[model samples]
Target chain A: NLKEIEQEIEKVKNEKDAAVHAQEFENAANLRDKQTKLEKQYEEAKNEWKNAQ
Target chain B: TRTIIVKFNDLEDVINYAYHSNPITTEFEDLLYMVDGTYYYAVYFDSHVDQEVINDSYSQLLEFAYPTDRTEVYLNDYAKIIMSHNVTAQVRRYFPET
Candidate 1:
């Protein structure tokens, strides 16, 4: 479960990095928002993941 | 995805927290016992924060426990570091100074 979130975030980070390299600030900003949301969701699920472990 | 989790795995981990609870044992491994006065000394980070944020969190933890400190942070899907409170030691040599 934690691995899934980790991978998701890693992929998003790569995409965000690509946006930055491409000079797509707008797209990068949007990706940043998406990344933040994903992080929040992961934070919320954090203890839940711990509980199961 | 550098999310840090600092815990007390043993009595020799931190002298301050060692005697925080009477007859401390493995049970103290949980983050709950890290509490003393006005401090949530131990914590687990939500994985996804930048490397700097995690390092800052470690610095904050050190600030609270220094002079007799706990500088242990274990992040999932990433590497781990456990060290004495002494700032200018082996661990500090590897990572950027806090």
Candidate 2:
């Protein structure tokens, strides 16, 4: 379950990093926030999955 | 941690689907969540529901309500932004913390 979400985080993180590399500051900032948000979701999903078993 | 109100654009249409449609499941599904095992949704009837109402509410996109007593409200994070900006949108509104 987390792998599905984890993979999404990786994909977004890559885009975020690319934005930063390109110096698209606004874009990078938004992406940065998104990456962090996904990380939050992953934690929640991880815990929920863990407890379900 | 706070409770944010997610005002549906048209509660009538939302209610319509809930009652008139499948009745078992329908479009208003995303608008529902639970607090301590009690299911909930927002209503703007006997009152005015507007963008500011939605603007007043907040959420973390696509959450299925976790088992915590944080007193927080989460909705599709991007919905408000898109309505505010008229789409013209972002890559990460991309999970965007609602």
Candidate 3:
């Protein structure tokens, strides 16, 4: 899951579902939302692991 | 009234929209606007709140559908700019009469 995500923002075409722009827009929106959530989770995990040390 | 303009980069994006039950159609008059004695409702969404428009008369974005492999991102960006301007203008043109 993590690998697929990094691939999306970093390497996947800035555009996906080129045949269907609406789905592309929807997917892009969802991707943006996912990235936001993932970043927050990463931060939380890092903080928790650090505090435990 | 407000106008909305959206851009699709290529055939794939266009097809994707169609697959997901969205597409650009000029004729909405034949569709059932209301059902079961209930009113119809629709809300607007702004995808370009970051750009400021100086005029409202340039709202027709030429949305072309090309194969994704043959599409260019520069054209996609250009199409979006044109779409934004035209949508605003379109609303201003028709809103007063209705």
lDDT top scorer: 1
Best by DockQ: 2
Give the runs in model 2 whose Cα sits over 4 Å from its true position.
B1-98
Error of 3 at B34 (Å): 39
TM-score versus the correct structure, for each prediction: 0.33, 0.34, 0.27
Per-residue lDDT for A1-53 in model 1, tens only? 65568789878777865664454546655676677789988987897878878
| Residue-level lDDT tens digits of model 2 in B6-38 | 333222222333333321111121223223223
| TM-score pick, better of 2 and 3 | 2
Model 3 Cα RMSD, Å?
A: 16.0
lDDT of 2 by residue, A1-53 (tens): 78789778878766755553453547756776777788889999889999998
Clashing residue pairs found in predicted model 1: none
Predicted complex 2: CAPRI docking category: incorrect
Off by over 4 Å in 1: A51-53, B1-98
RMSD to the hidden true structure, all candidates: 18.2, 14.1, 16.0
* Comparison by lDDT, 1 against 2, better one: 1
Interface RMSD of each: 15.8, 13.1, 14.6
Q: Write the per-residue lDDT of candidate 1 for residues B1-98, one digit (tens) a residue.
A: 33234444321233343333232111112232232211123344445545666566566545325322333432222222233233122212322211
TM-score of chain A of each: 0.82, 0.85, 0.52
Model 1 TM-score (2 dp):
0.33
